Amino acid sequence: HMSLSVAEKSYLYDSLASTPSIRPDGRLPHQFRPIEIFTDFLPSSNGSSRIIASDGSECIVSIKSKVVDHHVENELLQVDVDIAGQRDDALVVETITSLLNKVLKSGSGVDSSKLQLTKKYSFKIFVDVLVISSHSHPISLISFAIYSALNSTYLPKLISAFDDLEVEELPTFHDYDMVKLDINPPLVFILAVVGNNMLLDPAANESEVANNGLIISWSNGKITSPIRSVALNDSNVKSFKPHLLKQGLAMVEKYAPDVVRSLENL
Amino acid sequence: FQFPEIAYPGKLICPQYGTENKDGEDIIFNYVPGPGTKLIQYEHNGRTLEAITATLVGTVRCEEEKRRTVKNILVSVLPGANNDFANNLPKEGDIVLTRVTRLSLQRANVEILAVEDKPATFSVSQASSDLGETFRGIIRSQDVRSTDRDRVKVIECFKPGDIVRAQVLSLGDGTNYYLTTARNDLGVVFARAANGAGGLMYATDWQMMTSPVTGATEKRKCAKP
Amino acid sequence: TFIFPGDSFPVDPTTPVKLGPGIYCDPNTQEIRPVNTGVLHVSAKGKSGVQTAYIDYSSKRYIPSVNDFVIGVIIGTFSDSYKVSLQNFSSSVSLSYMAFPNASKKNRPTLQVGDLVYARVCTAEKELEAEIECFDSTTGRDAGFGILEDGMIIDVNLNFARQLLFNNDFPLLKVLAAHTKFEVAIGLNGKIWVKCEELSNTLACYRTIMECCQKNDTAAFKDIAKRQFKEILTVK
Amino acid sequence: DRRRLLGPAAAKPMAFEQELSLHTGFIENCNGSALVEARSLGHQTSLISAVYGPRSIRGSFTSQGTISIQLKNGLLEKYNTNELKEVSSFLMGIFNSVVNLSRYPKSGIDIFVYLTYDKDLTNNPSQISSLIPHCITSITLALADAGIELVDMAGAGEANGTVVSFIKNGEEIVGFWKDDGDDEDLLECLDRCKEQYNRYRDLMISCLMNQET
Amino acid sequence: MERFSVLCNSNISKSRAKPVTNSSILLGKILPREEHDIAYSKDGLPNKVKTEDIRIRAQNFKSALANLED
Amino acid sequence: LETIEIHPITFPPEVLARISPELSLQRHLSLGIRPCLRKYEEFRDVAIENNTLSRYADAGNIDTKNNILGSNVLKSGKTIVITSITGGIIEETNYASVYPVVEVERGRVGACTDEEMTISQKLHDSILHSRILPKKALKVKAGVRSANEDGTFSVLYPDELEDDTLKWSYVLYAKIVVLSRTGPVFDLCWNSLMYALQSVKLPRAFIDERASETYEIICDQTKSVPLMINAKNIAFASNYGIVELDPECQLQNNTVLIADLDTEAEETSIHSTISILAAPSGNYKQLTLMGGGAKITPEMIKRSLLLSRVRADDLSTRFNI
Amino acid sequence: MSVQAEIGILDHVDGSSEFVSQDTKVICSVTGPIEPKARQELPTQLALEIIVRPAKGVATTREKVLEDKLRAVLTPLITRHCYPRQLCQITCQILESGEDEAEFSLRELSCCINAAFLALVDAGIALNSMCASIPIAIIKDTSDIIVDPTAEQLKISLSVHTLALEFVNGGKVVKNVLLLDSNGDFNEDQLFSLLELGEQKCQELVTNIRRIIQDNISPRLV
RNA sequence: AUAAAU
């Protein structure tokens, strides 16, 4: 996104590619920038969140539910990604959409048992993402918002019996009463590769000079798929040694619980 | 003999610098990249290293070009019908065959089709003419002919569709190249009567083009065989 | 004697005929053949050896020709000239700044975009942008070509405009003079400029010329002006 | 639809040892082309890669080249359009390191990869991950055939859904694709794909030598 | 240069000049197939042309277009 | 008069083509040759691969995922054509056609060009008018599926009932991909579609007890019947052109017609053309004529009919073997 | 061959016409020469924008074929080299099919060719020659060649034909055959008997057409 | 040298 001159980029590379790596800001290779998160502001929805970054990057997530027959509806969690002033079709949109749907699959990184109502019916979860503004790869930004939203989601409570095979009662839900959606949303961390250094939460200027990048998912206190290498820019993309890949996975594996801990506060 | 005759893309050919011992004196061979080769950086065991690496699948040819002796060797890779020829690009001094796309009063813009090589043979630039991806060039009214540079009637010089052999003075901007037909061997080469509606016309006089078929004569800027 | 395209020509091949609108000389076969539908008009001068012809046909899309009087509108200004369009959806024409009386490289004309100008086409090539000039040498010492002020402009087919400019037997200018004072500019590009002292008279002229353009009748036109100038009175 | 002939809209669709074959330069419509066919067990994949470029972009001030990759469904409509865009983004992240971009300023290289077929056999009492190393093989061949300068030969392998692309003789990595499968397969997949890379590399180099000869 | 030898030498050794086996399951035989031509005699039967002969038709035209000025 | 000694500026064969498409054609026609190095009536060789991409490619092993009913790969010269036939089930409450989607690849992204639009319609119109596919041949003969309580699975279908009726109807969707184009390509797409239609299998359909909740109606994953089309109406495509060349030919010790147009030079400069769909029976399905560059004498039409008939014999022979 | 046509019926177009054969009624409009879009521009010749609108529904691929065939006729008719880097918009709005559009497009195509030609004449665009188009059909039992067939005749036809010829020399010399679109199957004897009788009725039509052109236009001229 | 390169 950001446009920089050849001189500025080289200086940034020198600052960040140094053996004692220094952020232009001054951050450490594992320090995130401060974010603000709002939740439960959309009463029309079952759950909602709004995340604001330090560079003005803003993302809004909404959670809606629908009763479906899990015998015909394979995917019980659908992620939808959007950006105002941006066409839906764009390569970045579909890629993030495809990626996010894999991160939150029914039988991969999500306890889909908590969505089951009866033998025959279950709750389909629609996770709608709206990226108002972003200056870098918003994959990690969206991930934090989806997490916050799914941890403050409330679904209707069933009243009728849960055996459609025999008695076959029509799904009825008691008025007013609702049950909080107990689930373990995964997180998606993005890393930047500048020389032999690995940075958590790459800034805009940092990503521009990066040699490569990593997209690493996180669930149940361990590294999980999808794991994707990603070109943060397209002018300075280079191959990387395998030890860097193992360094990145190790880096996430030790700093993720700290992030989750700061994120798990109700 | 030290370097492989034929190299695939990514195959190491020769290091940055080289030297040998002959006649009781050290002769320094300076290896420089060429068409089909690219000087890149490779590091082994924490050691940095620069070496000439071929980027095209071809036989490899070297050629010398310029007390204690001094030398310069040119390392290149040549492929080895279909012809691509990308390395070839309009540069100041080259001769280029163009076709007139439109006529204005103070200038005449064309499009580049082929470029003359060096010792005739030409390099055809393949592109879509119905898109605009083809390189465009502009011939100024002052660059039409050395005779009377000030006042030149562009209508009586070129014509839409006529083929013009010219030489590019400069790159110009991204839109238009600079073209001059000032010399004798430059001008309208192939053309037809009535913007291409009539029969073929041939070049007789430098400022006159006639057609030995319908007897038609149109005023053009003709070159010399 | 109506003439249609592809029609046989009586004239002999050895003897040339001067080109006229409607008449086409094939660049390939060198044959002279009519391409428009209408009345053939031929003029012969002297006992022998010269001829001229054209076809009066109904067309409304103007094509610039040398020594044609046209009324254009200057949409925009370039570095050394005005961009003026004679007609809608038609190629732009090049008008030189230096193509004015008392011209100088220091002082550009005061014409603004949206002004009407009376102009004559000097150089008009098929494959080149046409050019017009405010002053025409042929007419006289003074062209009488200057940008029009106010008034009203009228769309009219090329035939009706050509008859209004070259034919003195055309009663239109006479029947309008019998009703009111008016000044008129006539363009071969099918444009007619009309201006009176009062708007009601200019409007009345507009409506008459339009109907005359529509009606195409000598008898109707005299009456037409009668009912038009009458209708304005009551409308007043 | 006023663009194509979709037929009746009230109707419904139908409801019910590694071996390689390489061929390049069989398309005269573009600057470089490649055909890749692989058959393992009951599963086989045939795809075609078409390269158009490098062609000049008017008004472009880019000091380097611009690569665009798009995957298409030739016959069987299986893979989602959203997923095709994802792989395309992954593929471009690879060749932007492979292709010497400094050679083509103010220019762009378009890469079309037609997935005409893949055959899948599943027994009854990811998916596109297996095709990825074949797409990389096809593109690297089509680019080298076209005349595009490549810093190194790009190749990859698929091990338990974990795809990783190598250059510089497996010493470094130009791409990494992990979906599902199992954990702690980091060291294993890196070694298994490195063997597939070296195997795919030599056959790719031999391919150019054969056709070029 | 000696460093070149150990690494370069190692790299050269690895390929092993391995044998290559050629086959096409479906597409390969048909797609890379070179251009071909046939001619229908008065019998209405198609007739094939030698590949060398077809080229000769090409090289003969090139000589008849260049050298044979009138 | 003028008698002039002057030299015509000559260009290499590859440069002459870029400079002028007509000039590069005339120099060829003067020696009785074409830019594609073929004579006036010389066509392009045709080699195909049928039922290679279909699910019914192998008798023993049938693809459970593949939904292609019939397929064909074709390559005439440089241009390659890949045709795939899919299907649908439609309830129904004289001859028909198929709905083709031709994708000509030129290396440009965007919407469908006017070429792909016209061809898709031209294939649909010609099949519809050549009376290849009757609406009765698309009639779906359904069946029943009765299941034992884990004891057995039973499927029953009756041949007799359908004959008496003499009702779901089949719909054939087609997609045609074109690689390496070099000229007029409608004929190639037609021929590939014809070979593909010659080998189409329609899988039988049946419903497990269900009530008009959601009910899914299904086809069988194994059993199928061959599509019956009129071989007497089956036609094939070929293109022809008319042009005049001025150039003189030297001698060392009156219109001309070209068959099967290829190369830019012929597609661009030849404005008098003839297109024919001809049948072995000798019945002719269609004829395309448009003269824009030269007069079209009746003697040239006859040659085209003879040329087209010969092509039909050749194409017909290939299908048999 | 009792066709009826009107010329110059539209106000905001350089040229227009309304051709009617039997039921089949088509109105056409022509604007040009005018400024072309960049993608339309031809360096030396005139660019043709040809549009065909159906009587019912929106334009589909069917009309895309009508546009293509109509292009093959109008292209060599117009002296395009007179208008380099210029555009000519040609729009045909079929008002009434005069035939089962689900089966045939014969009469609509011929009527579009005749109407487009008339609109080009009205617009005053350089034409190399004249042109006329007629629809022809063949019967299932009788096998007779019927020129200008009705809709009912088409239903029972074995083949349908569109013939458009290029005329010069006062409409007496067939310069070329612009378009022949034959769908169906044919016998040689019937074809030339068709062409012989067809040429006669065409020549009669031109004579009628010339009469109509002179009668309407002459009052406008002086 | 009285207002220069939309």
Swiss-Prot record, chain A:
One of its GO terms (cellular component) is nucleus. It comes from the Eukaryota. GO terms for molecular function: mRNA 3'-UTR AU-rich region binding. It is found in: Cytoplasm; Nucleus, Nucleolus. Keywords: Cytoplasm, Exosome, Nucleus, RNA-binding, rRNA processing. PANTHER family: EXOSOME COMPLEX COMPONENT RRP42 (PTHR11097:SF8), EXOSOME COMPLEX EXONUCLEASE RIBOSOMAL RNA PROCESSING PROTEIN (PTHR11097). Belongs to the RNase PH family. Present with 7110 molecules/cell in log phase SD medium. Non-catalytic component of the RNA exosome complex which has 3'->5' exoribonuclease activity and participates in a multitude of cellular RNA processing and degradation events. In the nucleus, the RNA exosome complex is involved in proper maturation of stable RNA species such as rRNA, snRNA and snoRNA, in the elimination of RNA processing by-products and non-coding 'pervasive' transcripts, such as antisense RNA species and cryptic unstable transcripts (CUTs), and of mRNAs with processing defects, thereby limiting or excluding their export to the cytoplasm. This is Exosome complex component RRP42.
Swiss-Prot record, chain C:
Component of the RNA exosome complex. Specifically part of the catalytically inactive RNA exosome core complex (Exo-9) which may associate with the catalytic subunits RRP6 and DIS3 in cytoplasmic- and nuclear-specific RNA exosome complex forms. Exo-9 is formed by a hexameric base ring of RNase PH domain-containing subunits and a cap ring consisting of CSL4, RRP4 and RRP40. Present with 6050 molecules/cell in log phase SD medium. Residues 65-135 form the S1 motif domain. Keywords: Cytoplasm, Exosome, Nucleus, RNA-binding, rRNA processing. Non-catalytic component of the RNA exosome complex which has 3'->5' exoribonuclease activity and participates in a multitude of cellular RNA processing and degradation events. In the nucleus, the RNA exosome complex is involved in proper maturation of stable RNA species such as rRNA, snRNA and snoRNA, in the elimination of RNA processing by-products and non-coding 'pervasive' transcripts, such as antisense RNA species and cryptic unstable transcripts (CUTs), and of mRNAs with processing defects, thereby limiting or excluding their export to the cytoplasm. This is Exosome complex component RRP40. It comes from Saccharomyces cerevisiae (strain ATCC 204508 / S288c). Belongs to the RRP40 family. The keyword Nucleotide-binding does not apply. The keyword Thylakoid does not apply. SUPFAM superfamilies: Eukaryotic type KH-domain (KH-domain type I), Nucleic acid-binding proteins.
From Swiss-Prot, chain E:
Present with 2160 molecules/cell in log phase SD medium. It comes from the Eukaryota. This is Exosome complex exonuclease RRP6. It is found in: Nucleus, Nucleolus; Nucleus. The chain holds residues 546 to 615 of 733 of the full protein. Belongs to the exosome component 10/RRP6 family. Nuclear-specific catalytic component of the RNA exosome complex which has 3'->5' exoribonuclease activity and participates in a multitude of cellular RNA processing and degradation events. In the nucleus, the RNA exosome complex is involved in proper maturation of stable RNA species such as rRNA, snRNA and snoRNA, in the elimination of RNA processing by-products and non-coding 'pervasive' transcripts, such as antisense RNA species and cryptic unstable transcripts (CUTs), and of mRNAs with processing defects, thereby limiting or excluding their export to the cytoplasm. The gene is RRP6.
From Swiss-Prot, chain F:
The modification Phosphoserine is found at S20. The keyword Transmembrane helix does not apply. InterPro entries: ExoRNase_PH_dom1, Exosome_comp_Rrp42_subfam, PNPase/RNase_PH_dom_sf, Ribosomal_Su5_D2-typ_SF. The keyword Mitochondrion does not apply. Changing C219Y: Interaction with RRP46 abolished. GO terms for cellular component: cytoplasm; cytoplasmic exosome (RNase complex); exosome (RNase complex); nuclear exosome (RNase complex); nucleolus; nucleoplasm; nucleus. SUPFAM superfamilies: Ribosomal protein S5 domain 2-like. Component of the RNA exosome complex. Specifically part of the catalytically inactive RNA exosome core complex (Exo-9) which may associate with the catalytic subunits RRP6 and DIS3 in cytoplasmic- and nuclear-specific RNA exosome complex forms. Exo-9 is formed by a hexameric base ring of RNase PH domain-containing subunits and a cap ring consisting of CSL4, RRP4 and RRP40. Interacts with NIP7 and NOP8. Interacts strongly with RRP46. Present with 3180 molecules/cell in log phase SD medium. This is Exosome complex component RRP43.
